[PDB]
């Protein structure tokens, strides 16, 4: 029942694309999936069918059309740390693109220049996986948001 999960007063944002949030209560669905992940504050607007950048293109690629909802709330407590977050990582750059609905678990090295990387670094071979910055002493755009 998708009616009790809308007025529960326990979520920050609740945007639905294509399918209306008041019509999926009595609508049948074949397969229902859920991609639970935590990102930054400025990366919440990038999760939309038709955006681009360095996160929505190399990490989690979204199709052009989307017939679902985007659930995302705020924690900023029961999780996170003071003085910096050193637990989770995220890919920044990637030499190749990714098709929508695809997971990349390869710890490859981004090749910026023409020198072969993957193993040897020093110049034109940077580390793509970057660290977050979930700190409760910052503003709003620097808080962890769990996007499902």
């Amino acid at each position, epitope marked *: 029942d998708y009616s009790v999960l809308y007025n529960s007063a326990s979520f920050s944002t609740f945007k639905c694309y294509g399918v209306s949030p008041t019509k999926l209560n009595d609508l049948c669905f074949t397969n229902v999936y859920a991609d639970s992940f935590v990102i930054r504050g400025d990366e919440v607007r990038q999760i939309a069918p038709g955006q681009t950048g360095n996160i929505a293109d190399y990490n989690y690629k979204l199709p052009d059309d989307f017939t679902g909802c985007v659930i995302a709330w705020n924690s900023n407590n029961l999780d996170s740390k003071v003085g910096g977050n050193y637990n989770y990582l995220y890919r*920044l*750059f990637r030499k190749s693109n990714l098709k929508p609905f695809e997971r990349d678990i390869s710890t490859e090295i981004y090749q*910026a*220049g*023409s*020198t*072969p990387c*993957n193993g040897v670094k*020093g*110049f*034109n071979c*940077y580390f793509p996986l970057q660290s977050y910055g979930f700190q409760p002493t910052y503003g709003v755009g620097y808080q962890p948001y769990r996007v499902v």
Partner: antibody
Amino acid sequence: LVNPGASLKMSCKTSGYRFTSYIIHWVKQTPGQGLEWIGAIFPENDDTSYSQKFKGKATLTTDTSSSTAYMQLSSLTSEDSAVYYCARDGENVLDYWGQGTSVTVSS
Amino acid sequence: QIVLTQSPSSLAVSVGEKVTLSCKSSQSLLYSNNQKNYLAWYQQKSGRSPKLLLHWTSTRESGVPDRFTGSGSGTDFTLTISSVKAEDLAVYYCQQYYTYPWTFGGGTKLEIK
């Protein structure tokens, strides 16, 4: 015209091509001598790459909004005066290696 | 910090004559993983921007005549030009592509006899 010990800033913008390159290059060539590589720049995280000969005299800054690479030269000398060429580097060359500006150093 | 040595100092070539110029690198510029030689050949006409003629020594540049052909094995790299013309005369240079720091070991003026 820069006196010895002056600071010189050179900026070049690619024409007909919009970014789409993962490296930018700086070359110093004195007349009658071959081209010498100086530094390489990266569009995202700064490459901050400098040649050992030019290390401590060259600083590399890139601004995406400006769309022009910046090179700062310090402790200029009579030997330092030369034609410096803005360049780049993608797969090979795509109208990325631009022209050069003559430098004259005198009091 | 591999310096590259290029010879000779001068090249005398007649119009429509094949010529061979060779640049030697102190260390092999072949990456072990791809087993491919790395090197760049440059043309330097007077009052002109430095221009890449051949890349990797295996691929010709776009809009470049087949007359300019380069074959390089290990440390030794060779570039061969044919049907040389007055416009073609330029300083020829070899640039290491294998590893930083980049070294320009290019160095050959082209003249017409």
